[PDB]
Amino acid sequence: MGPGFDFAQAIMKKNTVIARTEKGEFTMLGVYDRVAVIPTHASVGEIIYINDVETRVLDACALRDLTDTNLEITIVKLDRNQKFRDIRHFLPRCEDDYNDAVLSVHTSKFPNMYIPVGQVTNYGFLNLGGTPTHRILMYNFPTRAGQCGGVVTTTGKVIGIHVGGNGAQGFAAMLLHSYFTD
Ligand SMILES: Nc1ccc(-c2ncno2)cc1
């Protein structure tokens, strides 16, 4: 409808796949080469389904901060025959607050879904499903089951992936440029 949705759509059309684990279907953001991200509660194993194709997982790392606190991001390298467009230059370098964000989801349950979530707070600590979690972004939208892995964007930046909600608020794990240096 506007330049926020334009950026979100450009990311969804080229840099997302549908990932299926034993714990469900997730929006999965491809970042560069064969490297993608997913919420850690997806419990990625040795084999994952990518757009309904059986795919070997070459590496999977559940990120934690230097206090050994959960960040709820898993970085996955996929044995896929094709690379993602490199979008690392759209990742923020530091923890921050944002105005006017969009949460975008693409699954079998929720195809081509875009949600203007508004202001995003650097919330920090969250007890997420009983697990102490850091670097959480918060938005005042009643997000539902099926939106985990959804991409949070502003104009020109990919800032997070949806990892939970409490019925009135939604929570995303920050994406930082330093997670994807090589
Ligand atoms: N986060 C939400 C909110 C509402 C819906 C919906 N309502 C009817 N059909 O879909 C879906 C996702």
Domain range summary for the chain, segments of one domain joined by + = 1-15+85-182, 16-84
* Residues having CB within 6 Å of any atom of ligand 1: 143-144
Ligand 1 centre and the CA of 119: distance in Å?
20
Ligand 1 centre and the CA of 108: distance in Å?
14
13 to 58, 106, 111: CA distances (angstroms):
24, 10, 12
* List of long-range contacts for 10-16, beta carbons under 8 Å, 24+ apart: 11/87, 11/90, 11/104, 11/151, 11/153, 11/158, 12/104, 12/106, 12/112, 12/151, 14/84, 14/85, 15/84, 15/85, 15/87, 15/151, 16/104, 16/106, 16/151
Atom of ligand 1 nearest to the CA of 141: 1
Positions marked active-site:
41, 72, 148
